[PDB]
Amino acid sequence: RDVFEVFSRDGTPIRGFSRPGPGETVVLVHGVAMDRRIWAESGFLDALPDAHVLALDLRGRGESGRVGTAEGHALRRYVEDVRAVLDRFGRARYSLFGTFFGGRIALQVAAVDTRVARAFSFCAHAEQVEIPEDAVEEEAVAVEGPGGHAYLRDHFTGRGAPPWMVEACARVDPGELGAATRGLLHGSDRRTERGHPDQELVLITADGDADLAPFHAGERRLGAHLWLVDAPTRIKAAGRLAEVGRRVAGVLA
Ligand SMILES: CC(C)[C@@H]1NC(=O)[C@@H]2CCCN2C(=O)C/N=C(\N[C@H](C(=O)N[C@@H](Cc2ccccc2)C(=O)N[C@H](CC(=O)O)C2=N[C@H](C(=O)O)CS2)C(C)C)[C@H](C(C)C)NC1=O
């Protein structure tokens, strides 16, 4: 692995790693309370034998620049972070894969960037969502204070998340957890669109997902393919991420 830095539109430095390979160029986008270490820890990275893998830390996470404001965590800024990585590696074709909100980011990048040949969204769909202001603010308060890491650790432990997902939360600055949560009130609720006709769009979720309807909506509206894994909930589906990586490898091959 080599490390890289690029700058987003708003000047935020975005840091990541590049794992060279002779195959397709894949860009990996982590979830909110995560960083780029999850790709190796989940076994997803090992499941892609040939790809040139680019894994970024989104703003405010990992080794990327701090933000600390709700507006600085607007979805459009994350999209800019990812597009800056596409610029650095200069390819005409990329395949994006994102987990949870990272999947939503990947879908939005696909909508706006014609260099995205494929986008895979794990446990996030493409449809418009309702984002209640009170629930957002309550969650932001719960994650940003002294007890915020413990709150998330307990939440994910009680819901059966894999250990790497439980542990990643404590690596995120609490102020960035709060600001990222509040960032949802700046555009995150709009549906995503297909970027161009030849793009391959894939949604993945738990077969037991309590809200599969919007995943089927994306099949109809975007021509996305839906992949299911054996799990009762989206959080538990994260235990299957390496297995999903093997199926991604089959597409890239
Ligand atoms: C419940 C709580 C622990 C959890 N909060 C987090 O984890 C982090 C901590 C800081 C904020 N965090 C967010 O996530 C932002 N908060 C939310 N987002 C919503 C959501 O529904 N997301 C979906 C994916 C999705 C996205 C876009 C479009 C479709 C689907 C989802 O499946 N979420 C599961 C939780 C579960 O299955 O019950 C997880 N998502 C985390 C991640 O993205 O990394 C890993 S687990 C809407 C508004 C996007 C809600 C709510 C308060 C607004 N709170 C959560 O989700």
120 and 95 in contact (C-beta within 8 Å)? yes
Residue 134 lies in a domain: no
Q: What is the dihedral of CA 216, 218, 222, 224, to 10 degrees?
A: -70
- Does residue 219 belong to any structural domain of this protein? yes
Is residue 32 included in any domain, yes or no? yes
Q: Which residues line ligand 1 (CB under 6 A)?
A: 31-34, 100-101, 104, 123-125, 129, 131, 135-136, 139, 143, 155, 177, 180-181, 184, 234-235
**Residue 206 is part of a domain; what is its CATH number?**
3.40.50.1820
Residue nearest to atom 40 of ligand 1 (CA): 100
C-alpha triplet 149, 122, 110: angle, nearest 5°: 115
Contact yes or no for 122/97 (Cβ under 8 A): yes
User: Domain range spanning residue 110?
Assistant: 2-128+188-252
Please check whether residue 43 lies inside any domain of the structure: yes
Residue 218 maps to a domain? yes
Strand, coil or helix: 167: helix
Q: Which of 78, 105, 139 to mutate to test the pocket of ligand 1 (most atoms within 8 A of CB)?
A: 139
Pairing state of beta strands 52-56 and 13-19? antiparallel
Q: Return d(Cα 204, Cα 230) in angstroms, integer.
A: 11
User: Which helix (DSSP H) or strand (DSSP E) does residue 79 occupy?
Assistant: helix 75-89
- How far does residue 139's CA lie from ligand 1's centre (Å)? 10
C-alpha 183/C-alpha 106 separation (Å) is 17
Overall domain count for the chain: 1
The residue whose CA is least distant from atom 46 of ligand 1 is: 235
Elucidated via? X-ray
Buried b (16+ CB within 10 A) or exposed e, 57-75: bbbbbbebbebeebebbbb
* Residue 165 maps to a domain: no
Q: Which two tokens stand for residue 105?
A: 């980011």
Would you say residue 55 lies in a domain?
Answer: yes
Residue 135: other Cβ atoms inside 10 A: 12
Provide the resolution (angstroms).
1.2
202 in a domain, yes or no?
yes
